[PDB]
Amino acid sequence: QFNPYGDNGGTILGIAGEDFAVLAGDTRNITDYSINSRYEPKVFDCGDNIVMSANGFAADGDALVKRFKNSVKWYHFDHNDKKLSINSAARNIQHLLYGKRFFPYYVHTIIAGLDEDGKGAVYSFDPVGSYEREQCRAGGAAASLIMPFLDNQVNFKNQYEPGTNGKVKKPLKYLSVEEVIKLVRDSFTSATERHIQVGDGLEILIVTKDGVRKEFYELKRD
Amino acid sequence: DRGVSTFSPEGRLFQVEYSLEAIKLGSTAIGIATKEGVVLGVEKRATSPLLESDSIEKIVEIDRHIGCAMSGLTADARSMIEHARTAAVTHNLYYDEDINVESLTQSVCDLALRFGELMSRPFGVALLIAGHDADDGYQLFHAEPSGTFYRYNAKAIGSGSEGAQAELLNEWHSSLTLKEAELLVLKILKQVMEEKLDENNAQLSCITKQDGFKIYDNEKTAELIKELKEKEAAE
Amino acid sequence: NNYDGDTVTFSPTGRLFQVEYALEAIKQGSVTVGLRSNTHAVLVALKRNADELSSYQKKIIKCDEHMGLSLAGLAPDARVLSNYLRQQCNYSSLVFNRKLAVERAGHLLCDKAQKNTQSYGGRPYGVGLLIIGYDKSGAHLLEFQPSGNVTELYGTAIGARSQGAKTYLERTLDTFIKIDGNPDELIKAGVEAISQSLRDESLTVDNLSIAIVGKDTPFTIYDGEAVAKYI
Amino acid sequence: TTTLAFRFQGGIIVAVDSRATAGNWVASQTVKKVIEINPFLLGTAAGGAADCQFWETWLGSQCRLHELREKERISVAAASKILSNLVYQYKGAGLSMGTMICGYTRKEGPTIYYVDSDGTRLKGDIFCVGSGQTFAYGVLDSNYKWDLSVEDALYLGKRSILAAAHRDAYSGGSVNLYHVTEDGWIYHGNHDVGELFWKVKEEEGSFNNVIG
Amino acid sequence: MTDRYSFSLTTFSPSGKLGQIDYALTAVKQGVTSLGIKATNGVVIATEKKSSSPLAMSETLSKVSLLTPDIGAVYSGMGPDYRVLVDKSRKVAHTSYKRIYGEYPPTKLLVSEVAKIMQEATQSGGVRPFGVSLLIAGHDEFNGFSLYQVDPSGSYFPWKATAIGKGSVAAKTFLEKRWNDELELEDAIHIALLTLKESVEGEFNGDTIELAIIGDENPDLLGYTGIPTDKGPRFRKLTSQEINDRLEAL
Amino acid sequence: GSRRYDSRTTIFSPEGRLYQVEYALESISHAGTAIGIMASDGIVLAAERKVTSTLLEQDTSTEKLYKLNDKIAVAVAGLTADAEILINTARIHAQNYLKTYNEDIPVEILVRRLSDIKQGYTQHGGLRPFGVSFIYAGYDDRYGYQLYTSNPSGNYTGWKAISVGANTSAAQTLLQMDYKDDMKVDDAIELALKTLSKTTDSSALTYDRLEFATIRKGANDGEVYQKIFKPQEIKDILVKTGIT
Amino acid sequence: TQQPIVTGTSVISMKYDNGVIIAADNLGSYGSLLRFNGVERLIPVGDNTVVGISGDISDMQHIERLLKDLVTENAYDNPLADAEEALEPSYIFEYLATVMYQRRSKMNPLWNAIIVAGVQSNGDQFLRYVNLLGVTYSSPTLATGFGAHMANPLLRKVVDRESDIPKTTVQVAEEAIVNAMRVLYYRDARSSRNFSLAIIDKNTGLTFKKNLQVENMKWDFAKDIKGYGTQKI
Amino acid sequence: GYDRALSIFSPDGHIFQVEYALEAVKRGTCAVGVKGKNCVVLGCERRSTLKLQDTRITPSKVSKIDSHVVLSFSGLNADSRILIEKARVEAQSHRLTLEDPVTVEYLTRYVAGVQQRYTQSGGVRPFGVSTLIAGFDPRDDEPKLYQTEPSGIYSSWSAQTIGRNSKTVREFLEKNYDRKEPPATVEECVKLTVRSLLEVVQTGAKNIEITVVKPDSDIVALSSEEINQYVTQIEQEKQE
Ligand SMILES: *[C@@](C)(CO)[C@](*)(O)[C@H](CC(C)C)NC(=O)[C@H](Cc1ccccc1)NC(=O)[C@H](CC(C)C)NC(=O)[C@H](CCc1ccccc1)NC(=O)CN1CCOCC1
Ligand SMILES: [Mg+2]
């Protein structure tokens, strides 16, 4: 019997700073035990300082990104070139996803950008549209490997102040773009080591008020 | 007879032009836009003294940030308001934000020409759509049955429109306060109204960023009427 | 006379009066001018107001990053047609990853307007459009009439007193066509062209409306203080 | 999930956890399971995350359209029935929703309606909904009285979620408290179980099963 | 495109007349004379075969039609309208009766179904009434022999004997003098031929006259044997020779 | 297009009348008179056939009086073909009610639904109305014996005695004169015939030009019987009242 | 819901400095039966694109007709049909990719794996894959079926990343493709010796080679192999 | 389907079909609505050219839409049934979804919306009917009286009349009805309603119908003798 879904592997990662936000993702595309492409980007600039990635089944992922990109275009036409805020984009994506509630897009979606106060924002979606704003989110094949590391290093979970008898927690603070990129790179090298579907290359998209910058790094190709 | 969507030799749609004549027979409605807010006011015009004038609903809420006044065949406005309200709430559902006043007006005006041989005839009612948004601030729109809408600093529609519009031309300036605008609507309404203006046969409303769209009480308007008369006698 | 009741009727001399009456609605509309060089294409439009208290009716609409038009006549009909163009430009992008040719854009509008002139119940569109764009074969300017007739031109103008600007462009043809790699000078030529259609009124800051598209220029519209440069 | 809401002398208490799971994978510890429909209406969320979140957001739009059309705030009964009639249309399609519509109106007073995805709609004083509902019931029922103070009622609601957060593997994160009065709903803070458990253990002397 | 005529083309005039029905009846008046006579043991229906050209083969054009094995029909007015009514009448006898009850409908009910069709052409959108009056002769077990007239309005009346079309006024007067309740079938055929000679002008023989009967069952015309209850059609069309035999002893 | 040929059947006159309904009533006024008279112990239906021919088969004929169910009958005035369309609908509606509630349909409910159908043809659809007026005669266990009438407008009203068709003005005056509330069926039979006999456009009223029917409780114990009179039975009742 | 009947096996391809090479054998298998031997599975569209198709052949023939019709439709009212407004590989691919995904979304897929190889108007190499699921991806080397498992490893030794493309000549690239086709003949049970090869170059244009054969095969060592373990005769 | 636009604008800006529908209302028998301090009374004319009527079974002029709301009308009788039916269904549909009976304003708004829809829908003519809708909202003791008309406009009235010679009875009510002090009791309200109809009717026998509606679904129709007592009382006071 025909199975309309497939697993294209890969993994993605979003972190939000004070005045910036990053959305990273490896460039490896796979089916079963074969590599399809060592460089197939899945993190996209969608306009209005919104970056998006829909990891999982690539065909559904591409379809969604394509449709959201188109949603941004028509938002400009219908509302006098108004900038689509990250919170508005998120809600719009929920309706795109839930629109196919009974034949879902098999993807974990993450978008990143700046909120209307200029602060860094990351939103994450399940396959049928439930969404939540967070400081931190990993998605995809190696999400289970990366996410607990992020809890520890971004949100300082289970870390207490030395000598305070485990009474005072390590205080929360925003990370610099330099420190965030260090965590992204270490997360992906670690994921590459222990997950077979992760490797080849790492592409990061950084979002500030100035625009959308890109950075690329090699990953192990085994 | 003849087609509903027929052009005249001058290049106008007969039915649209005839619906405009129906709007001239309607009761007067005035709107004035300021930097402190937008004021909407209407002539109620009760056909008989036994009619309870508070039930005459010619000023209407579309959303918290958008209000609406009407003139002409007011029964036709019900489905237009229903559409506007749905459009406003629906956009909030899809985009987690308030909808632009212009975008709302455009959505209403898309219904206008959806008639022919869709509904059987154009709307016989004009609307003054007032509101506020973060981008273009305080706005006043005049939505016709032709499908056209103009933004206005001030605008009068109805039977006393051409006389009131000429008065608004002289009186309006870019530094009008909200209180000044309120009185100005009452002043111009009292001029063009047949019966003598009071709190029962005329109604005021406004929309401000802070408090949103509010229809004034008959007690509040009565004081603004009394304040208006005193100021005219004072010089 | 007896043959103007609907669009489905021919006159004894072979005329469609309803289509001609729709054409008449354009002549009443405010003037708008279109012209192009080899690198850029420009739309200039005189906007019209109800009175001093009102805003000025927006004449120019964007269809894609590389295409858009100006209108003259029934504005709601321009909204319907511009929306159709937006969808067709968009269909070409999503399905073929291909920017829609300005020539095909014209062909699609022609065929949409035509269907309304051969069927009972419907009516012709009551608006004229000037479509500009930059595609794989360079800059383009089209003139759409609701009879269905679409025409590619170097320059043109439609609306009330459009004959003045159209004569000027016919004289200036050799000059403005070679304004390559210079946006501001091509606009100046368009602003001087539309000025030949003015009577009693002159071009003010909230009256003039300009749009441009070209080689390294997306379709953008200029209004308000952004057109003060060209007065 | 674990969610509860109970009626008492001083109005309504509503308490929920904040965990979200995908099987045994703890997907989130910071989910908002209380939807603020309006200043007088609350909705709780348990079951499918998208189903609850999408349709309760939609419910809020329908309640807004009611007060625009009728110039009057929608009743808790009418609001709950809009949702129950909606899910009933989708009965068999596989929606997964366990919700509670809580609020105050003049005609009704404080009111709670249990609404779920197989179409059940029930008015009641006490309800617990979710994978850890039984754990919440155990604590809530054994300590519930109508004459509880606002202070004691808030605590019992909090303590009942904490109990379920502890025992139920698919509940936890943090406790979100709400109090609904004649004047509307009042938020009573987010309470992380990480600190709240030990704070409760020490002060209350409970949780003796755990290594202190 | 599409049928935009969804409105009635037959409407009441100020005087209360339904114009198109009246005009349809006028068309029937212009039509060739046809008649029907009911006997005690049968029914006869007859009409003149007005030939459009002597080159035309009048045998191919059948004015008298079999509807069921025990029911026949003849008309006056517009032939094409009659032809399509016969097609519809034959089909409705099956769809709305035989496929339900496993037997042919009684005369009165088939007539009722034909009337319904003609009534709908009087009220439905974008159609004119049928320009014919029918005479339907038939037999059934519980009602015996019967004769019905059906007008463009959809009205139908049972008759002992009647005539319609060109010379119907004179023909009805002739039938009043000759008709009695003791008439045998052969006597009714004789009277039918006498009545028809008055209205016919040119040739009067078996080739210019079309005549059929509803009489006794005809086992020879059934086409098969073996079922006792099936005894054959009561409808029989008289041959050209059979008519001429009766014209000698006229 | 087709607009040119549209009569616009469902519109108002400047005076606020429905043209087609008014003209349909004018049509009905030329139809054979039909009379309904309601007594305390039954109902009478009498109707005059339209100018009969001597060669018309009288015994196996039905023009005026039709049976809707066991408890309800109607007298027709107007186009017969139109009436039959409506009668079959009414017959079906009665059976739907019986199928749904396991009870015979109340008279008014049947009358209302049939009248609602007529109303529809005057407000929408662009079709001509049914050129028919009914007299409904029936019984149910709520209101007992009932007489109603409906017309092309779709408006219906109840009556003690009523006429439709031709000469209703003259007929209604005569009924209003001799009718009284404590009347019996046999007396109502006599009134119905006497009224037709005076209002008829014919020279003399005979058995062959009439249709007659009664709805009595004259069956055995607490049950209603419908009697559609045979030719010979009309001949006898006409002699018994001294008209012939 | 389908099941493929008559099928085509591997389609292999790669980029080189000035263009792209694509190849596919001429077999139409009917299960284990090697039914049809004259089947062309490389279909040129214009003089700048070649679509290589594997999987169900009935569906392949449908796609042929669509592409054929696409050329016709593009020519309509298009004076620049053989110039600026000619069909690009990217246009042809996106069209197919749209169809493939629409068909999977209607649970009635075109049971194929497709590789669109060509050269764009600006000289850039185009090579992209799409299949019955609507899944798309691009790479310096692309292959379907067994090609993905056996050809890609060999072709990636020549062009392992983007920077290796300018360093690879058409001679070297074709040699690798022809070698890969031989390996597939050794090891793929539904392959044939006969195949077609197409080169789309930005300078020399489209070169379509038919009736090629796998040659220079190693079989001699087979004679020394006796039994399956112990046997010495 | 029949599509023709029957209700359309004319050069002077009038929709003649809607205005001719008002003429049908003007032809109809008079109907009056008067609301007191704790009640509403609906009075209705019945023309006396119809004798030999059966008043048991003849459709009553006042119709119950729910147990707490009533609807009277003037104009085409057949048209009124369609509005009443639609209103009754909407009344039950409201109870089903909102778990609360309709307000008199809501029910009026619905009926008025139906009437409006028929003024700009293809293939249909407007309703030749104006209605008086009266009753009491659930758990409320404030009397409600609304009027609708073919165009679709609706409004609330302290007292109002519609139908033939309604301009005469409206004249009467305008001077006899005090806003500051409405009819304090049921008797006072009924008397004023009967008085107003006696300006137009003819005889006070079987020509006047009266229906009294009180709070909490308390509706009752008066009999002939009960109404006749008001007629007898008014005439004796008149001779002065
Ligand atoms: C307690 C906490 C647990 O039951 C509550 O009941 C909460 C309710 C809160 C969130 C409102 N319920 C859940 O957390 C709920 C449990 C559940 C899951 C699936 C079906 C029914 C109930 N969890 C979810 O809804 C999660 C939330 C995400 C992870 C933030 N979502 C999923 O599991 C999604 C969507 C499931 C789905 C439903 C209907 C149609 C299609 C899909 N599924 C995935 O993300 C699949 N998978 C997760 C692991 O990574 C690979 C992809
Ligand atoms: Mg790896």
Side-chain angles (χ1 to χ4, degrees), chain A residues 94 98 101 131-132 137 169, chain D residues 27-28 30 51 53 55:
Chain A
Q94 169 171 80
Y98 202 89
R101 167 62 175 76
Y131 74 96
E132 183 193 0
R137 176 63 73 187
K169 301 172 73 174
Chain D
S28 180
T30 58
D51 290 336
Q53 207 179 94
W55 286 118

Side-chain angles (χ1 to χ4, degrees), chain E residues 186-235:
Chain E
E186 277 296 339
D187 300 319
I189 294 163
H190 178 76
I191 295 160
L193 293 164
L194 279 163
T195 313
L196 202 59
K197 187 183 282 185
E198 299 293 309
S199 58
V200 176
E201 192 157 43
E203 300 287 66
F204 194 75
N205 53 49
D207 297 308
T208 57
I209 301 303
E210 204 169 333
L211 196 150
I213 57 159
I214 309 298
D216 288 337
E217 293 164 316
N218 294 259
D220 59 312
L221 293 171
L222 181 52
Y224 65 94
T225 60
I227 304 171
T229 53
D230 298 359
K231 274 163 280 181
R234 290 177 175 276
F235 175 96

Side-chain angles (χ1 to χ4, degrees), chain E residues 66-71 85-107 109-114 117 136:
Chain E
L66 182 157
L67 303 185
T68 73
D70 302 330
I71 300 165
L85 272 168
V86 171
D87 292 331
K88 293 165 190 286
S89 299
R90 283 162 177 177
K91 194 181 181 183
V92 77
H94 283 79
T95 59
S96 79
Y97 204 96
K98 203 201 178 202
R99 294 179 189 180
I100 298 166
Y101 301 110
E103 62 198 62
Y104 291 100
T107 315
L109 286 180
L110 178 56
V111 166
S112 187
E113 295 290 350
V114 180
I117 292 163
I136 296 165

Side-chain angles (χ1 to χ4, degrees), chain A residues 28 191-200 220-222:
Chain A
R28 173 175 278 180
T192 302
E193 288 289 303
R194 292 290 179 177
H195 205 101
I196 63 172
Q197 302 179 339
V198 178
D200 295 323
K220 283 171 63 167
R221 297 156 69 89
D222 64 340

Side-chain angles (χ1 to χ4, degrees), chain A residues 71 75 78-80 82-85 87-89 91-95 116 131, chain B residues 90-100 102-104 106 133-136:
Chain A
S71 191
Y75 185 83
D78 296 325
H79 304 87
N80 196 232
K82 180 178 176 176
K83 195 196 179 188
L84 184 65
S85 53
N87 70 285
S88 300
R91 179 67 70 78
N92 175 236
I93 291 166
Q94 169 171 80
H95 280 83
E116 284 161 308
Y131 74 96
Chain B
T90 298
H91 177 100
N92 176 248
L93 184 62
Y94 292 154
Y95 298 106
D96 184 32
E97 64 176 26
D98 282 10
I99 111 277
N100 296 135
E102 200 210 61
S103 300
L104 189 276
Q106 181 64 262
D133 58 54
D135 298 318
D136 290 27

